[PDB]
């Protein structure tokens, strides 16, 4: 019955809006400068970053950066912190997925473990366009160029993010679509360590059905968007890897730099 | 048109049948499946490997284990020769796909370049079971346990393929199913260096519609099988990424050998 799958879709979309403060729709309204009811401050260089606090609340070194906790490090920890923020929202959203909280606690954890980062990059896309990404809840916009020019290492951490964002956004999915896709990602079943694989696959099959009908119904003219979207799932895996290793490099070349334990936790390499 | 998609399917099935000698139907009958009208020589130890390579039809090397080209290497060189044969069979099959030969030649090359590995591992699954893989046109069977007890480097080579094969074959796809799946993999559109993506995706979109109807008619009670098969494509992607990796590692083992040149060519890299 397509009727029960539309109800699952509505349920998920409803929860999604409740768990993520900045929707893609609000993101695009902000990025498409035509809608100027409140526009973002743009950080495109060391000078813009400096004043990026005069107006926007950035509890981070406004002045000199080098000998005083360099800019590259601060920007990084800024995203680091933004990631944990997302991990808590994604975690809250996951609890609303029917069947999820009834799964063995150990698997719920495993599902969140590997799913979170793939979800963070999918949703990060919503705040991006070829030239940059929205920051501080959309109050700001940091350029893709400014980020590409930071300290040797920290200069290629966001690049593969925009690469993915670019091709992912070309699909033109909206929040109602993303809510089901994100749900699908959390309930994989091919994660390492899962104790009870069947119960997870059964829920995912239902989510898969919901997503299929949803796309068929919201993008009637987009042939095979469903197949197209499922494959992007490999681009996500590659980003996580590159990120984890580039993360290990900072680990030993910046021993004075810390990493949030939540992120450090969902971070069991390999 | 339903009939149109049914025509594309039987056509790919027929081409598949003529390009690929050993069918999964044929391989299944041999493997775990009883059907004893011709049994394979089982290679489960070094002795059986010697007492087999000097008896099984293998036009390359022979039993040589002791200061005479080690076993792990001889076996490695064997799957290389096998993989190179598989490339020629996959190539002929691609040409049978409607629209493929109409594409810009450079693109045709690109699609095969980055597609043959994913295809090779997909069809390898058909020759595998949780215990081993059929060898030599199906005249042999090399145990999984044996392949994993090889020299440090070579002992982790086939395992990640068995893991994949085990999960993949669970979907119980037959040859008419696979014929379309492979065609879909070939016409990706997201391969690096492609000059004209539109026609490629139009064709794959046509191929995806044919696989979909095929899975629905051939597996009416197999729910969301279509979505599950597509999610396995990323599984292929990873295996490929991991393979070329452990491979580059081998590069730092077998190298400078003034007699390998004309053979190094034949096996370039892919």
Curated annotation (Swiss-Prot), chains A, B:
Entry's Gene Ontology molecular function annotations: alpha-actinin binding; arachidonate binding; chromatin binding; DNA binding; DNA binding domain binding; DNA-binding transcription activator activity, RNA polymerase II-specific; DNA-binding transcription factor activity; DNA-binding transcription factor activity, RNA polymerase II-specific
Broad class of the protein's primary localization: nucleus
Effect of residue 80 to P: In colon cancer; sporadic; somatic mutation; loss of ligand-binding
Gene Ontology CC terms, in alphabetical order: chromatin; cytosol; intracellular membrane-bounded organelle; nucleoplasm; nucleus; receptor complex; RNA polymerase II transcription regulator complex
Positions bound to rosiglitazone: 80-83, 117, 243, 267
Domain of life: Eukaryota
Sequence motif 9aaTAD, residues: 261-269
Outcome of mutating residue 18 to R: More than 50% loss of ubiquitination
UniProt induction comment: (Microbial infection) Expression increases when incubated with M.tuberculosis or its lipoprotein LpqH; induction is TLR2-dependent (at protein level).
Activity regulation, short description: PDPK1 activates its transcriptional activity independently of its kinase activity.
Location of cross-link Glycyl lysine isopeptide (Lys-Gly) (interchain with G-Cter in ubiquitin): 18
Domain NR LBD: 4-269
Annotated localization: Nucleus; Cytoplasm
Tissue specificity of this protein: Highest expression in adipose tissue. Lower in skeletal muscle, spleen, heart and liver. Also detectable in placenta, lung and ovary.
UniProt keyword Disulfide bond present: no
Keywords: Activator, Biological rhythms, Cytoplasm, Diabetes mellitus, Disease variant, DNA-binding, Glycoprotein, Isopeptide bond, Metal-binding, Nucleus, Obesity, Phosphoprotein, Receptor, Transcription, Transcription regulation, Ubl conjugation, Zinc, Zinc-finger
Post-translational modification as stated in the protein's UniProt record: Phosphorylated in basal conditions and dephosphorylated when treated with the ligand. May be dephosphorylated by PPP5C.
Family: Belongs to the nuclear hormone receptor family. NR1 subfamily.
Entry's disease: Defects in PPARG can lead to type 2 insulin-resistant diabetes and hyptertension. PPARG mutations may be associated with colon cancer.
Function: Nuclear receptor that binds peroxisome proliferators such as hypolipidemic drugs and fatty acids. Once activated by a ligand, the nuclear receptor binds to DNA specific PPAR response elements (PPRE) and modulates the transcription of its target genes, such as acyl-CoA oxidase. It therefore controls the peroxisomal beta-oxidation pathway of fatty acids. Key regulator of adipocyte differentiation and glucose homeostasis. ARF6 acts as a key regulator of the tissue-specific adipocyte P2 (aP2) enhancer.
Protein name as catalogued: Peroxisome proliferator-activated receptor gamma
Origin species: Homo sapiens
Residues of the full protein shown: 235 to 504 of 505
């Amino acid at each position: 019955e397509s009727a029960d799958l539309r109800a699952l879709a509505k349920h998920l979309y409803d929860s999604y809006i409740k768990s993520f403060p900045l929707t893609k729709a609000k993101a695009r309204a902000i990025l498409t400068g035509k809608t100027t009811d409140k526009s973002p401050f743009v950080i495109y260089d060391m000078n813009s970053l400096m004043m990026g606090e005069d107006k926007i609340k950035f509890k981070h070194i406004t002045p000199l950066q080098e000998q005083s906790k360099e800019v590259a490090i601060r920007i990084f920890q800024g995203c680091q912190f933004r990631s944990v923020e997302a991990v808590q929202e994604i975690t809250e959203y996951a609890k609303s997925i029917p069947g999820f909280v009834n799964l063995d606690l150990n698997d719920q954890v495993t599902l969140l473990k590997y799913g979170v980062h793939e979800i963070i990059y999918t949703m990060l896309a919503s705040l991006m366009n070829k030239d940059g990404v929205l920051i501080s809840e959309g109050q700001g916009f940091m350029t893709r160029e400014f980020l590409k020019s930071l300290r040797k290492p920290f200069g290629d951490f966001m690049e593969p993010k925009f690469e993915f964002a670019v091709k992912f956004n070309a699909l033109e999915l909206d929040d109602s679509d993303l809510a089901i896709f994100i749900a699908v990602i959390i309930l994989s079943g091919d994660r390492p360590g899962l104790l009870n694989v069947k119960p997870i696959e059964d829920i995912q099959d239902n989510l898969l059905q919901a997503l299929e009908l949803q796309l068929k119904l919201n993008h009637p003219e987009s042939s095979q968007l469903f197949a197209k979207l499922l494959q992007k799932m490999t681009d996500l895996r590659q980003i996580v890897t590159e990120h984890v290793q580039l993360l290990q490099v900072i680990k030993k070349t910046e021993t004075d730099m810390s990493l949030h334990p939540l992120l450090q936790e969902i971070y069991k390499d390999l």
